[PDB]
A = this chain, B = another copy of it.
Amino acid sequence: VTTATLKRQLLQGILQIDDTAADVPVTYGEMVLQGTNLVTALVMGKAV
């Protein structure tokens, strides 16, 4: 990450560009806390 000025200064001639298109995921993860971990989060106060 940088400032737009430094980005232009880098892209001028110093760095060697590799691509223009990337592949980012379009999802998150998920934590649910159901079942054998729920009961221990209600009887005692810990869960894994």
Contact = CB atoms under 8 A, between A and B. Distances in A.
Interface of A: 36, 40, 43-44, 46, 48
10 contacts: A36-B36, A40-B40, A40-B44, A40-B46, A43-B46, A43-B48, A44-B44, A44-B46, A44-B48, A46-B46
Protomer copies: 2
A6 to B, nearest CB: 48
A36 B43 CA distance: 14
Nearest to A37: B40
A43 B36 CA distance: 14
Chain A to chain B: the 4 pairs with minimum beta-carbon distance, closest first: A44-B46, A36-B36, A40-B40, A43-B48
